[PDB]
Symmetry: D2
Subunit: 461 residues, 4 copies
């Protein structure tokens, strides 16, 4: 009588387990950490509140933390990102999970609240694993007494890290954090390479549109923007890129993209007159990658080519003005996480209207909403960093320090480069790669240990 969960359908558990057993074989860094730390049980006594996309790959992360001695209570950090078979398999292993694909916002907040509370009172949580900072925000705003007993937060994504750095600048951050996002084996692998794989995947599963010879506009050329632009270009899309960062824009130019603005002269003065109508009238696909607000705005959405696809692969749906479309336009569901938005008016639509946009995942993370997110062998890097981060903060035991000692340890840090390299080495062995060992003369010549680290902390890769 394990009942401490809520999932779409517990009978998907056997299916979820089959996919976890496959995913294991694609995740050598994560499975390496299981084998290495199994005996030592470095997370014995850890009580982890987890808020991250309840996928099969997140399942292998959860079962790694549990194998190392942790107990967890889990939710998803997105309403559309759960794989119901993954959620079912985790619940079936006797692990509290509150996640299903297609939550309401009310259900999303309820799921996070079910991790935080056990039998209607605060859980004895002492660790937080977060992706986007929604759980971190609720603990700070609603459960400050719970943070007194928490040793730290391990934050997955750019948007979550920004929110931590704001709290730290404001003196409101209550416990230390590891920025998992800025391990090279996370930010390069997941933020960039993962989006090369999963963006075109999500747009095919959502639309089945030919992308070859069609026109895309990618907003942003950070790690997600670079991966997303490549995802489309490798399918033969004509990709244009927008940026606010001239260094990122210069990279897009050198990578073979045309750098354009949705605005005449790049000036976003909020007028319809500012919109480059000729440019947006040629676009078949717009993708937002920024982590910023309203980068695909009402006037852009009015100007887009009839039957353009619109999607967001940044963390939050507010990249796109979906509030404007809900207010002004009629939404026809094609199938789950695919809507035609009829720009003819609010009150009904003609079934044969030609004047619509296709919105994926209601503007939520499209790679998780309309596909399965990044493949296991990429999520291996991210999640091995999460396990190492959890071990590091748990072992430091911030909550048990005196006030004077807390003041010295209250920071947002990254993992050491040596760990980043050890994750990378396990990932390279999963491709059958063979890394060359430096001779002592070579190691002396470039001024590094034969064991590494191989690069100064300033190296960009």
């Amino acid at each position: 009588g394990f009942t401490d969960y809520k999932v779409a359908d517990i009978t998907l558990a056997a299916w979820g387990r089959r996919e976890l057993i496959i995913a294991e074989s694609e995740m050598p860094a994560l499975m390496g950490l299981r084998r290495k730390y199994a005996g030592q049980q470095p997370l014995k006594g850890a009580k982890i509140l987890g808020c991250i996309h309840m996928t099969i790959n997140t399942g292998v992360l959860i079962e790694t933390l549990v194998a190392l001695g942790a107990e967890v209570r889990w939710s998803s950090c997105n309403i559309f990102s759960t794989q119901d078979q993954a959620a079912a398999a985790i619940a079936a292993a006797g692990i509290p999970v509150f996640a299903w694909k297609g939550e309401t916002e009310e259900e999303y907040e309820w799921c996070i609240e079910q991790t935080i509370l056990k039998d209607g009172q605060p859980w004895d949580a002492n660790m937080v694993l977060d992706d986007g900072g929604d759980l971190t925000e609720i603990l700070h705003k609603k459960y400050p007494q719970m943070l007194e007993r928490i040793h730290g937060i391990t934050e997955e994504t750019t948007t979550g890290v920004h929110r931590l750095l704001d709290m730290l600048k404001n003196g409101t951050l209550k416990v230390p954090a590891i920025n998992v996002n800025d391990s090279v084996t996370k930010s390069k692998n997941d933020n960039k390479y993962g989006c090369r794989h999963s963006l075109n995947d999500a747009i095919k599963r959502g639309t089945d549109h030919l992308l070859s010879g069609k026109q895309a506009l990618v907003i942003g050329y950070g790690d997600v923007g670079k991966g997303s632009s490549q995802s489309l270009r490798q399918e033969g899309m004509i990709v244009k890129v927008a940026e606010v960062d001239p260094i990122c824009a210069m990279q897009a130019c050198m990578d073979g993209f045309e750098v354009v603005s949705p605005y005449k002269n790049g000036i976003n003065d909020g007028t319809e007159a500012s919109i480059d109508a000729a440019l947006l009238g040629k676009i078949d696909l717009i993708v937002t990658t920024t982590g910023n607000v309203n980068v695909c705005d009402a006037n852009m959405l009015k100007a887009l080519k009839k039957r353009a696809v619109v999607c967001n692969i940044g963390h939050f749906d507010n990249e796109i003005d979906t509030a404007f479309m809900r207010k002004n336009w009629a939404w026809e569901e094609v199938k789950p996480q695919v809507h035609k938005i009829h720009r003819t008016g609010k009150d009904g639509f003609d079934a044969h209207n030609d004047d619509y946009l296709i919105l994926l995942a209601e503007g939520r993370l499209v790679n998780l909403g309309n596909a399965t997110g990044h493949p296991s062998r990429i999520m291996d890097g991210s999640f091995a960093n999460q396990v190492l981060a959890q071990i590091h903060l748990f072992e430091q035991k911030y909550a048990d320090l005196p006030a004077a000692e807390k003041a010295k340890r209250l920071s947002v840090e990254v993992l050491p480069k040596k760990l980043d390299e050890e994750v990378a080495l396990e990932m390279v062995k999963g491709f059958g790669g063979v890394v060359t060992q430096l001779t002592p003369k070579q190691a002396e010549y470039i001024g590094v240990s034969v064991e590494g680290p191989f690069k100064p902390d300033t190296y960009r890769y």
Copy 2:
């Protein structure tokens, strides 16, 4: 009656000037600095010792320094890198230059000495611009009294910066330096993007070999390694990548390369038995990108496929064991900077022998040796950074500081990110790119100025 120069042929000057006038139109960041700072003359009184490849692009750099008020004495930092028409055009403008393509080592040292000495006595130099640290080493070892009057060094390349950091660690660095290499508008565009353009260029000019469907082995996957691997892959080469750094190896895997070692299990124990002879017997082309020593060693060269091409695009020729080849094997010149190395023995060779390797530029920087180096629009980024760096150190006037104040300013620094972004923006405008301006609400949301900088100094791009 200007005689204070030595070049291959002064009669090439008019041709050099025609190419400078074209190169100017490709270099908007550099030409922007001319237009911005012409009036202010920020380098009035600067006396710059320059040691960097005497190309047409280096011509535009020199004439920008001179336009902003500097006097210079110039040499090349490589025996094969000079474009004799560029050297001629600079000499003909009355600028002391000592450079020609195909110097001896004795002539190379003589050319640097001719910049350092004017009329048989040390020049009143107060600035150094170096690429690889050869001029910096000579000043420190042979002319220490000259360093008392020098305000700083602006160093171009990975290898030069390593040598500076060794001097700083040892307390032997006598003047402050700017690491120009680690501006993003240098390291990304020059070290990576430039090698995508110029590596396959140099191999075509040197060999005219079909690259499509042939096997390459690229040693290293730093910025040069990445740009080099792409240069060959985009021609349809089957590229294998060797690495000591598991993070760089992981990037090569994710980029779609097989990661291999020249040694069995990556162990370089110095025996012929350690060589993967099966692997090296399949390789048509080997490129060294490391800035390390002996990464293509004698035992690798013995095992390479008959008639493989061998080249280096790292700073120094000692990446390849050319000394072994000179000692043991017979060199046939095909044409300038192309040798067949006959592995039949050290004396004669038969013109029809099938057992040879093709060496490019005698193992020197192949893109400058067998072609013209990076295109103007790439060198624009590097050289705009060099001008800003020269202005910054010259204006700081280190040599004039009191002893106590010197101690505080003796460092190896990079340029501020705002200047990096300003160079990037001028490069983007040269592609006709339009950068979007943040609204005040967007800038607040991501926590930056509308004017930038847009990223923290920890951002990797």
Copy 3:
């Protein structure tokens, strides 16, 4: 009272209709033919037996034939290729269709028989539209009297055309045929470009495996082999190609692939000793593209790397020896159209066994089995040719000709180049492409009409 159909679930009709209304906007050549021929009703009196994948795109073909005056009875030409929502939408429009995803072989033959028979007696069919020749074979073997009244066959695919040309060579072909496969707007668009899109799509939806930096072996480098190889290479797979045709092999080399054989020196003498076990032990994915038999044989399947993916994108499953695997090895269903094949024995498997292959769609057409086949904008070209072919043969009225006149018209022909060009132009306009008009002087200079055709019938494109 319409009951003359069998589909998985009639309640999927509305969803199918929403997808048909979208697919119409992607299919300008097909929807152009509707608009052009609607008034003339050129297929009034046509009674078409259709046997082709019951997808949404096939829906737009069926409704185009019906819009031009035809009546049809439909089946799928593959047990896994049906989209149940497409089948439902067609049945709901009152069109007899006998198709669902995941038919047995017994159900497959029953569905074709339900098109051929209406109320237990032969339908008054006078046209055949076939894909692979299964319906054509049944009519010739079992219903020869029905062929007396049939005007022609329009055959979609390479394998079907081969079977027709065998019948013609043997004098057993009873009615004339159009080879739709060898229109350029079919063979290029569908056989090549379509597989660039749909192969990587099907492998992602089936496995979610990272393809980047993994090793593939593509068997064949015809049109499907070329499009398949590109599908994997553009994801950053290391693709090796097998071929029997040295001209196709030369194209694979020049395209940047290594050409290998599963057999030592290419000799398939049927011994285990002949297998290149070193090569097949490195392969992560094998794809069959040949239309030939047993090109991924028992001994190859034994030698494949543990946990390799195995799939077929040729017409028939017998490219792979799946009969050997059913006989010898235990099948674990992961999810629909995905099996683990446990090489440890027949009568059970360890749930944690590491020694398995992943088979997609039981060796059936993977792009249709594990995804949705080619996108609408590609299937537009194929299906526009099918409509024109149906019109041409129906209007020729072979079945009504005298015996002497029949003898002259009994042939397998292609559509004229002018019609091929008119399809191409409609497809170009769907990308917003603008085709240049020849001047009279230019048309004279290259010896063509300003209206085309632009190339002789020998031109290969």
Copy 4:
């Protein structure tokens, strides 16, 4: 005392011979024919007039014909395409050659006349090997008595074949011809793959412009158009394609290019009003690939972006209206085969004028004019077909046939597919490729011999 030649510089012979010895190692199909036919001397008594680019690769073809028993008299078919070291090496072997880089039109005609006449009277020629039909035209118009004793013409290129088929249609063709162009091992390898290698090579050697992130317009998308578009796209150019042929335009769309016309709605009426000035004002590089006349016309040249590069890789310079530019605009030589065309007027120019175009090779074949043409390993396929063609027509002995027998053999034919496959196999072995042998059951299943041919003559590859 051999004096029966004219070359730039006989002293370049040793250098030419060194390059021939290297080129031979890259040309296994050609060197295979030497080894196979050496004993049999199948061209003993052949007297071949040769008109084709006097490159190193042409040198290997010449010396193959001579090795098989032929005598030759050679000229280049282009004023800029000779490699003077190749010409020197051939003259030094005692082979009559009349070729240098940078001929006048008057010199070009003189060189062809020196092959046709020996000691002021017609040579005893009995074979023609032509590339573009200039030698074929002169023999027909000026030396009809010579054609009486000639057994055939072997024609290299699209333009030459068009001219032959015009003579055949008009009944003016005097001797049979083999169309070498339409061997798959010529048209795919040379026309398409070769231009991927040599177009970007010629543009880098000529201009050293960065192509990444810059805009290209390619006129035509036949074999040369396809290879040229890829050449630029693989460098990261934004490539727009123009076509008259909707099937070729459809291919460019599917390959990921935007298809545009220099003319509004594709209509040229020869008004300035018809020019898309907005489009041509954005183009950095225009390349003509058509074999047509005036496809880059006066009004296009007026509208091109300032400092755009203009070049032609079709056979004849009349693709570009260079006559207009010679009449109206001032030509400043940058260096050999590179001009700035000053659009300010005819008389002088300002050295610092910004309103110029860069023209390569005065609009002659850019890959041969500004580089070396295709690499040896590609020219191997073309030239092996030339040798087989020469053997076939020489052995048929047309000139010796009775009039009735001539009438039956007067055609323009291709080589049999079996020979095309045998050339391909030798090229595949040069990449180390291993071609699979069909089993007897597989050969039965697809209806081919185990020895081939593998495809019907209608197959497009």
